[PDB]
Design an enzyme around this catalytic site. Sequence first.
Site, PDB file in Angstrom:
ATOM      1  N   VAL D  45       5.599   8.945   1.042  1.00 20.92           N
ATOM      2  CA  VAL D  45       4.954   8.691   2.678  1.00 20.92           C
ATOM      3  C   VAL D  45       4.955   6.663   1.787  1.00 20.92           C
ATOM      4  O   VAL D  45       4.351   5.685   2.956  1.00 20.92           O
ATOM      5  CB  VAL D  45       4.494   9.558   3.128  1.00 20.92           C
ATOM      6  CG1 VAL D  45       3.897   9.491   3.934  1.00 20.92           C
ATOM      7  CG2 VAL D  45       5.830  10.708   3.228  1.00 20.92           C
ATOM      8  N   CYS D  46       3.454   6.933   0.995  1.00 17.19           N
ATOM      9  CA  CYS D  46       2.990   5.826   0.417  1.00 17.19           C
ATOM     10  C   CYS D  46       3.192   4.195   1.472  1.00 17.19           C
ATOM     11  O   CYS D  46       2.877   3.574   2.382  1.00 17.19           O
ATOM     12  CB  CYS D  46       2.017   5.918  -0.602  1.00 17.19           C
ATOM     13  SG  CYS D  46       0.912   7.710  -0.596  1.00 17.19           S
ATOM     14  N   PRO D  47       4.447   4.296   0.254  1.00 17.50           N
ATOM     15  CA  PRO D  47       5.101   2.940   0.278  1.00 17.50           C
ATOM     16  C   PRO D  47       5.086   2.603   2.168  1.00 17.50           C
ATOM     17  O   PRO D  47       5.044   1.327   2.217  1.00 17.50           O
ATOM     18  CB  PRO D  47       5.638   2.922  -0.346  1.00 17.50           C
ATOM     19  CG  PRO D  47       5.854   4.206  -1.419  1.00 17.50           C
ATOM     20  CD  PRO D  47       4.747   4.976  -1.041  1.00 17.50           C
ATOM     21  N   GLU D  49       4.049   3.713   5.533  1.00 15.67           N
ATOM     22  CA  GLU D  49       3.151   3.470   5.323  1.00 15.67           C
ATOM     23  C   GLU D  49       1.973   1.086   5.423  1.00 15.67           C
ATOM     24  O   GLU D  49       2.020   1.442   6.133  1.00 15.67           O
ATOM     25  CB  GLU D  49       1.738   4.480   5.462  1.00 15.67           C
ATOM     26  CG  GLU D  49       2.388   6.089   5.820  1.00 15.67           C
ATOM     27  CD  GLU D  49       0.848   6.860   5.955  1.00 15.67           C
ATOM     28  OE1 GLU D  49       0.594   6.772   4.596  1.00 15.67           O
ATOM     29  OE2 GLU D  49       1.003   7.003   6.591  1.00 15.67           O
ATOM     30  N   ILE D  50       1.810   1.034   4.345  1.00 12.78           N
ATOM     31  CA  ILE D  50       1.803  -0.088   3.292  1.00 12.78           C
ATOM     32  C   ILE D  50       2.709  -0.853   3.946  1.00 12.78           C
ATOM     33  O   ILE D  50       2.467  -1.947   4.648  1.00 12.78           O
ATOM     34  CB  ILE D  50       1.588   0.093   2.002  1.00 12.78           C
ATOM     35  CG1 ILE D  50       0.636   1.110   1.814  1.00 12.78           C
ATOM     36  CG2 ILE D  50       0.948  -1.008   1.433  1.00 12.78           C
ATOM     37  CD1 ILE D  50       0.600   1.936   0.595  1.00 12.78           C
TER      38      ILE D  50
END
Lengths: 191, 191, 190, 191, 191, 191, 190, 191, 191, 191
Positions: D45-47, D49-50
């Site tokens: 999910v992290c990338p 969001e960024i």
Amino acid sequence: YFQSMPAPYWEGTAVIDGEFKELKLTDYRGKYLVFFFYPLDFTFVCPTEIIAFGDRLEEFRSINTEVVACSVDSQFTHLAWINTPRRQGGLGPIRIPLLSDLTHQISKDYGVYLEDSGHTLRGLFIIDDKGILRQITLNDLPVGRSVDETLRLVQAFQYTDKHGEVCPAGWKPGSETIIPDPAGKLKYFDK
Amino acid sequence: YFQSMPAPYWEGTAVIDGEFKELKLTDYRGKYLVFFFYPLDFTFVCPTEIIAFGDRLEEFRSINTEVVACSVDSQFTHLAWINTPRRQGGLGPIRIPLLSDLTHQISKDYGVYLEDSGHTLRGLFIIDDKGILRQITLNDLPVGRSVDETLRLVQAFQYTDKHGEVCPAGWKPGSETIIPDPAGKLKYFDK
Amino acid sequence: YFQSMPAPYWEGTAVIDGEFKELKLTDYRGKYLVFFFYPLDFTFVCPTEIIAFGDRLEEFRSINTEVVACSVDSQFTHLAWINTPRRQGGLGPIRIPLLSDLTHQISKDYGVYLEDSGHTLRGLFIIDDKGILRQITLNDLPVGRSVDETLRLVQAFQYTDKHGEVCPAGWKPGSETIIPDPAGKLKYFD
Amino acid sequence: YFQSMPAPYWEGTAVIDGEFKELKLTDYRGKYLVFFFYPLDFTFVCPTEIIAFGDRLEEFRSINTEVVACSVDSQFTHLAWINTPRRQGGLGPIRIPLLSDLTHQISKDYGVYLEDSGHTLRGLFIIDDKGILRQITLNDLPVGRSVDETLRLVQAFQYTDKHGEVCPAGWKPGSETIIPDPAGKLKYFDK
Amino acid sequence: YFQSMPAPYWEGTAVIDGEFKELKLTDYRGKYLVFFFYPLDFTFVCPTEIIAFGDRLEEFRSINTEVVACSVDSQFTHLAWINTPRRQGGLGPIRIPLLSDLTHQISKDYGVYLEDSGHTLRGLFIIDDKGILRQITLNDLPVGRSVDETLRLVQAFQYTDKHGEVCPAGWKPGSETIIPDPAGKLKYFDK
Amino acid sequence: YFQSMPAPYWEGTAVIDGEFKELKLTDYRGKYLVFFFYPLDFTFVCPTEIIAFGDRLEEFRSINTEVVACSVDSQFTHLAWINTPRRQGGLGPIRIPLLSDLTHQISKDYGVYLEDSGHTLRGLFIIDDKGILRQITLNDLPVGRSVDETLRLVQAFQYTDKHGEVCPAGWKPGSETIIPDPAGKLKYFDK
Amino acid sequence: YFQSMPAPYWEGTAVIDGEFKELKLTDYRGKYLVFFFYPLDFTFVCPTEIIAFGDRLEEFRSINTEVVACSVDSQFTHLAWINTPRRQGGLGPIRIPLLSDLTHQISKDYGVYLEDSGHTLRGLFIIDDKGILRQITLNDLPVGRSVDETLRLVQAFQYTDKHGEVCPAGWKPGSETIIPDPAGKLKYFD
Amino acid sequence: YFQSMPAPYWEGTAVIDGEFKELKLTDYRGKYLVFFFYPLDFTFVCPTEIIAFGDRLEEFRSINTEVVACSVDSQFTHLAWINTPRRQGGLGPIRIPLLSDLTHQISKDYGVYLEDSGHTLRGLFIIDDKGILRQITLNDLPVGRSVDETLRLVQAFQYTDKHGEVCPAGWKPGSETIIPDPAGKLKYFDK
Amino acid sequence: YFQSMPAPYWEGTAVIDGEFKELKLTDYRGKYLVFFFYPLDFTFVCPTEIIAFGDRLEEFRSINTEVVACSVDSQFTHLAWINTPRRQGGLGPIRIPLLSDLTHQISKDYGVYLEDSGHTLRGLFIIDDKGILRQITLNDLPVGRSVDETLRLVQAFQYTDKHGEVCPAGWKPGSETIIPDPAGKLKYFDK
Amino acid sequence: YFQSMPAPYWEGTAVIDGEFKELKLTDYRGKYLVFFFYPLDFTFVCPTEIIAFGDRLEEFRSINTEVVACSVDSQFTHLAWINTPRRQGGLGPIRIPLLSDLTHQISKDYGVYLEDSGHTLRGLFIIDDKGILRQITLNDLPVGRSVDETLRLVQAFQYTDKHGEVCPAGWKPGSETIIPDPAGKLKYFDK
């Protein structure tokens, strides 16, 4: 406990003539103050007490005495309650300030906060013109207080303040008083 | 502080009909009790309060209520004061027990002991038939309490205990009461 | 702080269909719960939030989710407010419970009590069917929350609960998800 | 907790345009800041969001708002991840600083550090131009945040900062607002 | 600090043959273990040490010894680094486990965590088949360790374990040893 | 633990060229120092280590590096041991100071004291010209240290001090080094 | 405990010549003081002791000694008791001060307060002209003290203060004394 | 303090008829005991007190009362003093036990030990047949106690033990007593 | 401190007839033991004391008394010192056990450890057959103890153990003793 | 504990030439002092020790050394005992001060007080002219000390103070001493 304890300081938001106003205990310096807590807006005995004092307010103000009521409810709820007709259990227009104690600090400072309930008991305090606590009346929830008795007590404290004589049980204006001395007292007791 | 808190237990020596008798709070279980402290034997307001209750004692006993008075004085001093004529500031024969609190433990347990003075303030307690504290009245020294108001309060607590309705400000026998429900309350208010 | 922690237990008096009823967090086990605090009855943003959720309650109930609102006001004040028309800033009749937190214990247990103010901030909690806290949204007082974003989050958590894929930024029903494996992830990325 | 709490200070090494640079919270005074933590570089999910914030960065910077992302990963790893193609789950070139919190101090200061996991949850913070915390959004690991909602909230806080009005549930630019006064509120509620 | 102390227990997620697996210190009981920490994935000396050991792993395996490397980086970063070519400062494929210590508990348990940096120093530990710590080598950041010296030490410890003689300075297989008794020692010295 | 920690201060009586002299860690400022503890005079591995370094002392002094040995033995015992022939397990004449740590304070300060045994393990410390600790090597009792490896480490630390490049695993003079930057590292890794 | 300890300070309200007056221990500096506690007003042994000392006050005043009585009773009760005839167990008019210790602080400072009873035991203290405590006599409740023994003790302490010889067992004025020296003592013994 | 406190227990070596014997407080149960401390053997008032009681001992023993003297001196010094003639300041033969309190424990237990002097004050204790302390007489060093007054007190305590009447100031056998009742007391007072 | 203090327990490695042996205080139960500490091997007064006792050992063993020496030196140092000729300040062969106290625990337990010096003072202890401490002799460093005086003391203690008479100042075998009774003592003193 | 510890200060009342005088440790500065405690006046070994030293006082005074004796007995008992014939177990002729330690403070400060007994053991202390404690001799109760040994120790300490050579076991005036150096010691040993 000691003699002549100052009433604890309080400050907070009150509803006064339909407006939110900051109010503090020291605003009443120079006047007696009947400061009373009541459990909860929109309940049962509470409006009857606020109305009983409010409708007889001039009997206090005419003897240099003011009245303030306080509960844990917000100032918005106070105003909503003032704006509720008496016939629905509201206050209608009221000339006594309704102090809000949302944080409970004022109630806790006066020892009247019920930890299990999240509101106060029926605690009434008579504070003299110097800010000194003279009388405490604490009622359990189902039984309202007396405006007659509160008036009598204010009258008595003002009389003893002025004269230095002391007020027997049940004293009302016009009643006999006692000179608080082993010799002086006999004027009352022999009579 | 919580609601329906028991009156603190006490026991000590009392003067009862001129004799030293052991007395304890639980002796009053099943009856209402007006338990009141007064500063000092051989003083001023104190005799007037003891006499005021004593002379109206049947108004309490006839409604299942007893009365007990307490000070920090010894039982010997209580008896000496009973044996002093009313016209000299004495009590004369008295039907209310005079409890002695020489150790100050009873006074401190009730929060009425004055550390600076070595005696109590004028603290009165209404305790129900189950030993639960219902009302606290604390007067500063120069102003006596009221038998009329004490009677009204006992009446009201007894009434609310029996009926479950609540007593408005200033209620006396015969006065309107409130059903403590958001709907039921309107029978009282919507008049 | 650890992951997958239980929502703190609460119980208290709520106004439900105009009556006072005892309510407990554990009454919602088996269902998602949107549990939100609002500052104060008879104020401004608060009724708009309660009404927004209440009027859209089926969008939650149709996905096995309930909604409960809470403030520090008494149950008597809650009922007075329900009994106030919407055009006067009241709630009118309402189908979500209004929980009372007079003692402040519930608010403090959820970390949303403002010591200086004597009421909560705008704290919303999404609690899953097992009682585990999945989402916390804390707004300062002058800005209301979003029913639409709340729904998206409930949908997203239910989806990840069922499928064990994860939901990218801004996921809505129908959007692509990711297999949380260093190899499987490439189906999404590549 | 209290009304208008300052966002905790932070400082550390960030990757900014492919370079290691010292970055401090106070560098953003005068502007709103969306400051968000994400669990871990080279995850799922992290990338997204960024990238979601990065690709829409001008929607923030054009309303005087900056964006900073932070994880517990080292700056070397941040750079390696920037240098990984998006099709392999990397970031590619990114205009949002990637702050490194190897010591965990920043994450602990913001209350988003997971002691059992060794990384943060998905915690987003909206900080105003005076450095005051206005909004906290905390997601469990499997569900990404929303750029749309973040924009709405920034817009609403900026609007309420400027006007004597509050923003109802679901407000977007153009929507009705409320004058936060018992009388003035009726302009909204009467409809 | 005492003689023959057990290596502190550890467990965590490791990358082994390109997959994430749980790995425990106790998995190596019965074998010597060279357990080493390195500062950070995607840095400089670190890959040279991991590769030096990995490429010479059979020199350990052929003498009942395993090798495990550990840093504070996540398992996702470890795998991304394995998937980076050696010519880009990557590891390429590797046959020694890469243990992740995101929480820092393992590093702190081994006393190699740098509080100011948020990663370990270059700490290597030789643990015998009974789980006892036999050797500790700690290098500051800019200087890598020696596989050859590590091998010499493992050999020496294994030899002394088997024979109860002791190994002089610089001992290598084939070198003279000493019988650790005041009389037996002269076989070595007295020539 | 933090980066660039100062070696703990020490002072005490040493045997230097057959005489008792007070010696202090600060006497070695401006030079690297190999400061090493050995268990006990008149034992087995210990003399081999002292002799190994002593006989190769110029390889250190040639590169601005001194050597000091230390045990818990008294200076009188140190001297007796120096005066004992090598063939009986003595030292013979020695150009390395033998520091005495009778009180155990130096050993404890260096974390090498064994509470159960009353002497140190085989702890060696490389300390730079600013008194900063660069390397720690701790061997259990049966296995001697290596003069070769110690020399390599001193050379490596001096090299990195001078050049600011870093030393790969197994570096010796003449070996390739790395530029500790994400871009500059590729000069080495590309081979 | 140590040698030559000062009597603890006290102050309070006393009944003196039928009136309430503040009285302090330091008012008696320059004189010996017989300071005694009695359990309670309107009791039994207590008036006999107060009367015994009061009626013989000149036997103390003629040797620079004063007498003060103290109980835990109030000053109002003290005065009532003074105003009670002797034939009724009262004091009658009296010439020694009756100190009130309602708070119990004085009694506690003198170590004579009974925690179980709420009054003192029968504690008598001989305090010299410098405020130093010279003698402590503590009787259980049913047995009164002796004016004559108290006079003997005051006489003995004054004599030793003046002469620096010491007073044997049962010494009275006119009795042999001892020179407190290993050589001088033999004038007495031999 | 409290009413009817037991005399603290004691035991020690006493000189009894020229011999060293163990003596305990409980040896005197069933009888009254005059237990007294005296500063020091070979001093001045002390022998006059021991002799005064000793020479009148039958006046106590004939009313079921015993006498014990105690100082901090050793039993050897006590015996030496007994063996010193009266004309030299000795005791001569004595029928009262001389208890030794070298450790000071007994003196401290009785609160008669002078920390500055290393001996007791002149402390006398009247202990009843049940071991209860009835009277404490504490004299400063230069003034001896009274056998006459001690006998008077023993007689009075024995009398009030037997009859339950109380002893007025100055009571001696034959004197009037009081019935300790508010009514009965008048038999005494009316005279 | 009390009468009849047990000697603190000790155990450790001793050199006994040229071999390392575990030795315990309890090994000497049933015998008197002269247990003495000396500062350091290879020093000055110390060898003279060990030799002085060693060379007269049969004078102790003939009277059921053993001798043990102890320093903080290692057992290896003790053996080296034994193996050093007397003409070089060595011991030569010795029949007294040399106990090693490397950890300092024995010295500290006996209160003879010098914190500033890292060795003991010259403390000698005479311990009876029941393990009870009878005599302590502590000398400052520059002055040796006396074998003559130690024998006298052992003889004296054995004599008084056997006969229950006591030994005057300077007693040697054949000297007059005293019956420790106030009467019996005169047999001695009358002469 | 440490080297060259000052003897604890003491002051108190002593019997000197038959008179009571205050005596202080500091009165002896510039001279050696033999300061010894004995258990009790009027006992057995004690007088023999006091007499043995006192009768030989010139063997101390002629070498700038004084002698003081101390017990827990009072100065009055000390005088009585001096005044007792030697043939009765008294002291008689005496010229050394007898210090009284009634409070036990001095005994406790010297570590010789027996808590169970209430008196000291037989503790002797040799204090040099600078006030530094050089020698401690502690005997259990039944065995007296030696004047001859005490003189030997005083002579030895004075010799070493003066010459800086050290005194072997059993040294007496005229005996060989040692130069306390590893080289200088051989003049003594190597004969």
